[PDB]
Amino acid sequence: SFRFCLECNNMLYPKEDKENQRLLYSCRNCDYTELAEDPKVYRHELITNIGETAGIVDDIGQDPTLPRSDKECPECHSRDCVFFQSQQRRKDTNMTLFYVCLNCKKTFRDE
């Protein structure tokens, strides 16, 4: 989540306030500035797992092309779900399956 400016709306850039010795978020088209809630400024994940759980929707159970399983839902204990392996398109992606209960829509595995 990146933050811009509520007036100018330009993407605010992080800049240090040397005199008070605190981190600010400054604009570049006007004089607006505000205090930083997070010392972290940037993160780079080399060994990443983001996106695998990204593809979750409410109508996946209406797709008749998906295979159906008997797995017990932890929430409602229904005997009717669709399942699918990971939608992550990496070459090293695992083949472990995700099951989606058609009632509460929770995602679990067989581990």
Binding site: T65, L66, P67, F83, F84, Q85, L97
Partner: protein, 49 residues
């Protein structure tokens, strides 16, 4: 046989099916006769030759 169709080899199978019949194993002999699914897969391999 590759997943030409989104996550399946033919529209007569469900998605994410890696079983023998799904990815081109022709169980029958030429004497017995091939099923329609097997037939197309055999024609794909034959075309490549």
């Amino acid at each position: 046989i590759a997943f030409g169709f989104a996550d399946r080899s033919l529209p007569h199978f469900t998605k994410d099916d890696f079983s023998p019949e799904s990815k081109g194993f022709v169980e029958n002999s030429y004497l017995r006769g091939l099923t329609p699914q097997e037939f197309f897969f055999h024609a794909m391999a034959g075309r490549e030759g």
